[PDB]
Amino acid sequence: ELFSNQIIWFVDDTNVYRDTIHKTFEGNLTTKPINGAIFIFNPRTGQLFLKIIHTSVWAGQKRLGQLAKWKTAEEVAALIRSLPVEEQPKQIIVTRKGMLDPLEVHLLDFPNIVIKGSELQLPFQACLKVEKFGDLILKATEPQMVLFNLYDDWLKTISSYTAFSRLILILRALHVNNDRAKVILKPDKTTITEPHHIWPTLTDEEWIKVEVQLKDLILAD
């Protein structure tokens, strides 16, 4: 399925509508939208299209959580239209079932694209506390798209399958227990992440140990 000659995108809309809530001194709830993002991810190549969603899009609107699914579908369609046909996905896998109907209705001009849901646990939400992404999203003053390579230099020495599995363990572990996962991912005082990389520079042996530890962290839940 994944990794063939077919271009596949995972689309995660979870983080499009975000807010903070607090109690006023008068005892009422204040809900303040904050910037969000769509994650559109190619598991073969590691390519991420990060569409930052600025809070201005919600101006004058209600039911923002529901509207966000439709915004997501509109943005996926716009991205597809901006790409040459040879770069357009053959399959889009939505991580949440609420995306199925909105995306169906917005992709009617793309009969070659198959849309399906998934039960896979792919928490791109964890990226919001990876500082690179977190501050970029927080501080944006308008919508924009940013490209990333979520596999860093891994594909020089491992397959797409291996890289995808590593990424998922990282994201799930960060999701389950951010603080512990970050410790696991920094095995040495001298462990660094390159400025243009997302993840640390680790030896092959270090990654073996990391992968087991991340898996165990996810199991411990």
Judged by CB under 5 A, the residue of 98, 125, 140, 187 near Cl ion is 98
How many positions of this chain bind Cl ion (CB under 5 A)?
7
Residue nearer to Cl ion on the CB measure, 89 or 123? 123
- Tell the smallest beta-carbon distance from residue 119 to Cl ion (Å): 8
- Contact region with Cl ion (CB under 5 A), list: 47-55, 92-100, 137-145, 181-189: 92-100
Query: Per-residue x/- mask for Cl ion, residues 112 to 141, rule CB under 5 A?
Result: ---------x-x------------------
- Tell the smallest beta-carbon distance from residue 23 to Cl ion (Å): 28
Q: Counting contacts by CB under 5 A, is residue 175 touching Cl ion?
A: yes
Q: Counting contacts by CB under 5 A, is residue 182 touching Cl ion?
A: no
Window 15-44: residues binding Cl ion (CB under 5 A):
none
Judged by CB under 5 A, the residue of 38, 172, 173, 217 near Cl ion is 172
User: What HEC string does the chain produce?
Assistant: CCCCCCCEEEEECCCCCEEEEEECCCCCEEEEEECEEEEEECCCCCEEEEEEECHHHHCCCCCHHHHHHHHHHHHHHHHHHHCCHHHCCCEEEECCHHHHHHHHHHCCCCCCCEEEECCCCCCHHHHHHCHHHHHHHHHCCCCEEEEEECCCCHHHCCCHHHHHHHHHHHHHHHHHCHHHHHHHCCCCCCCCCCCCCCCCCCCHHHHHHHHHHHHHHHHHC
Judged by CB under 5 A, the residue of 58, 90, 91, 96 near Cl ion is 96
The candidate with the shortest Cα–Cα distance to 177, out of 221, 211, 219, is 221
Judged by CB under 5 A, the residue of 32, 81, 97, 196 near Cl ion is 97
Which residues contribute to the site for Cl ion (CB under 5 A)? Answer: 96-98, 121, 123, 172, 175
